Amino acid sequence: MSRIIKITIIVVLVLLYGEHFGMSLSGLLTFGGIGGLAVGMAGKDILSNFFSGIMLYFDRPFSIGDWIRSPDRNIEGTVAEIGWRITKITTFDNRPLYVPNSLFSSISVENPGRMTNRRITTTIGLRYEDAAKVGVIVEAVREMLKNHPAIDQRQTLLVYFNQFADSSLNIMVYCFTKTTVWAEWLAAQQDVYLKIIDIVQSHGADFAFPSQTLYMD
């Protein structure tokens, strides 16, 4: 490294002071231009990382402790450190991940750490022989979701029959919870799913397995 610095400083000093004992201006201009062009094209990525680090210092979409995501690259985890060259993120298996800063200047960054609600989405697949009950079942499910104390009634709440699947008639369920905590949301989802099972089974319907019609020789 010391030698490298020696040679670099010698080259820079020769390029700068190359007139008192120096020579042709055309030759020095060409030599320095070739060298600078090569150095500028070669050092683009490191300088881009540092420029994006400065940008993150001034305008940062996240903060320390925020869970972040991206649909373009795998950067999932919680932000642990923001540096000048890389960002250190703790993944969900407790491993450090070092993301170059320039990535934040070209990809879309999602911030689940700043969410306002957690979403519950599921599909109820009934048998084709249960087509006469779909209506009432839908109503029942909707009613339950409008009386559950864990459901945010000011957000989207949809329960509708909307798909002819290969083996089942599909009913979409789409709602939100008040809490944003992981365990509380999971508990609310489990309770809702169990209530859905009870509602489906109390009306004489059942969930559909993959089905086939077989013709024998």
Ligand X SMILES: CCCCCCCCCCCCCCCCCCCC(=O)O[C@H](COC(=O)CCCCCCCCCCCCCC)COP(=O)(O)OCCN
Q: Over the Cα atoms of the chain, what is R_g?
A: 31
Among positive and negative, which fits the CA dihedral 189, 195, 199, 205? positive
Under rule CB under 6 A, residue 47 binds ligand X: yes
In whole angstroms, what is the distance from residue 108 CA to residue 198 CA?
41
Q: At closest approach, how far in Å is the CB of 3 from ligand X?
A: 4
Closer residue to ligand X in complex, CB, 85/146: 85
Q: At closest approach, how far in Å is the CB of 208 from a copy of itself?
A: 7
Q: At closest approach, how far in Å is the CB of 126 from a copy of itself?
A: 12
Candidate segments 2-10, 49-57, 68-76, 119-127, binder of a copy of itself by CB under 8 A: 119-127
Q: At closest approach, how far in Å is the CB of 95 from ligand X?
A: 17
Q: Which residues contact 81 (CB under 8 A, 6 or more apart)?
A: 64, 87, 88
Under rule CB under 6 A, residue 55 binds ligand X: yes
Burial of residue 29 (CB within 10 Å: 0-12, 13-18, 19+) is exposed
Closer residue to ligand X in complex, CB, 20/154: 20
**Sheet containing 118-126, strands listed edge to edge, beginning at the edge strand earlier in sequence:** 118-126, 169-177, 158-164
Candidates 51, 161, 174, 193; binder of ligand X (CB under 6 A) is 51
